[PDB]
Amino acid sequence: RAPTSVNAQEVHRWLQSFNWDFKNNRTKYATKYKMANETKEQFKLIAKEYARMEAVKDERQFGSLQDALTRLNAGVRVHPKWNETMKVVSNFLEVGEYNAIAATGMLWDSAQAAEQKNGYLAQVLDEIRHTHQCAYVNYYFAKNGQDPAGHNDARRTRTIGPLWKGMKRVFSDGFISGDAVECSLNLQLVGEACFTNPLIVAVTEWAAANGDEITPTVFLSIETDELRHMANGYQTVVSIANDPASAKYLNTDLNNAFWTQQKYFTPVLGMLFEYGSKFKVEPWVKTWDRWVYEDWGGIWIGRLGKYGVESPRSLKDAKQDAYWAHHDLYLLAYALWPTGFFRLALPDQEEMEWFEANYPGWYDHYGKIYEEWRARGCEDPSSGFIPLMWFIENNHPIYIDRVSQVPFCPSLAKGASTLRVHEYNGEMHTFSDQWGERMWLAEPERYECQNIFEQYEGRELSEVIAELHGLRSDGKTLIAQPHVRGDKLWTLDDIKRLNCVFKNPVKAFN
């Protein structure tokens, strides 16, 4: 009569046999691959043990947030540029965690081995936990931060700008629309293995250097769950390694997956890091190289070699398009500052010294331009000037990639400057690289997303902002700002007086 019990491993040892073979036991979603029915999972968990290991992580996280951190006034003693930067990093990442739920739900429906199914299911719940975790960061900074607007309504205000559309492409539609396996790669084999896992930790670093202790408390917890999701991505390539069709499609689905992801995070992450902070952590060119070229492309992809996985073919191309990519985009992002849900700042003297030192030649280009804008008054609402006007005057149109949705200006870009324009049955399409063009030519009905110019055509700037609640509680001052100082903030009237009217830059070829 000794005290006895049962743990997760003892139950899980029989989980594989919960599934029975029958005429209609197959996936409901389209696919080209065949996931083996004797595929096994790396972690032996049952619903109850999962819940426990996760509730223990929560105790720590929430205890710090509500007690010590709130007592130290952590949500305020942060640098202005970072407070803003977190409005984006947290909410954009949130949508990535949310679709990740549907993604793994679609995967749990694809696998046939009950164990593999139990693997995706565990991620379905983890992603739900992450959605609510990113949500909490925004929530916490609105309640106790130096500037709530944005942190409080990113879910609706983010729909005003163009940086949003591209995020949906990589962390929303890329995760759930296509062959289950293609989606798996976009999400796990690439999305998480190569970008989030490294990013999550990097974010806590930059956040810490800039006074933010809130973010590292949550993202460090999120981090503890990523190794299982990666194991899912690995086990995905294993469950189809034997299917003959694999040797015919795997590699092209991965290349397309890899390009889809770096095409947005390459310019966006580096941008948020270097221009959204005060104290720097590490030059982005160095970082990008370690993450993409060495860690992922080399090591992580080398282990799948025996399963017939080749390094991405578009890898070297990505590396050449990357050098100036993030610097080129901030110009477009700052010039379109009124369309965001956060306040942007121009580089101060210490930062300009930092950039030129890290990116030789940066000053003669971007620096001289920002200084021009500042003297003309881009920070002062009474100037009547916003950088967009400078692009128009100097004839520098800004396009939107029909596939990736990433904004690009081939006329001014110091990095990639290729441009391909086409017309098909009454509609025009603009492209920025050889890979996305193929994707469209080959799958035209998959990429029909309207860009901001198309949607806002003929519309006056201030009205679009008003219509989409881009204002602060007093319904007068704008959420977004051309500077992070506390006074002289722009209002809806300051914008109205500019009388700016969106136009479709592709009609110039008419």
Binding site: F18, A135, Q455
Partner: protein, 388 residues
Amino acid sequence: SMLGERRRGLTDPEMAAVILKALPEAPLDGNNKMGYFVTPRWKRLTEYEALTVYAQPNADWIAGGLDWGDWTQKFHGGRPSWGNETTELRTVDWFKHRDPLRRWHAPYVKDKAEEWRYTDRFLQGYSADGQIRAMNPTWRDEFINRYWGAFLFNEYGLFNAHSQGAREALSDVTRVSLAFWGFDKIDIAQMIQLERGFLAKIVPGFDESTAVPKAEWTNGEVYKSARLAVEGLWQEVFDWNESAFSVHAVYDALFGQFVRREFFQRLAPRFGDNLTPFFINQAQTYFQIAKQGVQDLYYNCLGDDPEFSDYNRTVMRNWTGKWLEPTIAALRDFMGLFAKLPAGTTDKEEITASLYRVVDDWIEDYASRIDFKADRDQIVKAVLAGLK
């Protein structure tokens, strides 16, 4: 080093000074409530609602969405990431639903964790207190191992029926609820096995292998009709709403409730088995938890939608009748189990009042919500006919 090499802006004097110098005198907006633009279901907005509503990027074309434009990437063929085309049901807004229990991830795992820990403690006491001595040998080796153990596959099948829903649900509130329903289902399935594993540990002759209970499930006769129903709700249904609704407001609400509360929960105590009920109390607590969601979604939101009240109830009533049949076939076939029981376990007078308890409850909680004219006396009759 004792001081570490990393300098944190919150504690480094120099870096903190720059930070404080750049700060505004007061916050730049008095509105510090995240999700303030969400329509509250109760007196004042809750964390549940704030952390959840609108996490999903739906555009205005999917009832209630706040974004605009088509999706950025769709399926080969043009299939949208999410669309009205995935369900027959229609509504004014898919973000209307609200789990009455307000469960977001944190509270959900806190609860299932406390339960796990207590379950562990309960088993260590039961085995130490040698209570196994009072349990009937036949009920054990036969009805728990074979019959109750077979029922795990029925629960495992309902778990899997949720998969697609986990992908097509048109809103965050609905997605989370669905996720938790199915997750709780697989929980029960692993618990039925846990009980078998435990008995293998305290009863020298017990074999934990799922061979016996599975064989009974696959080629038996008592669960036959029940298994066909399961396979259909899972793999022959592609409509995520027809799935959640049919599985929870019909099949499990009738057959399921009967097999758990009217057969095992009722007869195990008579064979000196308080072990199996310890677990059934969890399944029933979960059942009663889910019901509140199913009800708010299909009745308070869709069934009584200010715009599609009629259309939905019609579709639901249609669905109800569609499955009320394979569900009655499941129950009828089940009755063949009472002939297995030792003489004198229970009479026909009891298993008649219990069937009415089940059906009558199903009517006041589900059927009358969509005005599906159900007849209690005909259903009981149809079922009983299976008593061998």
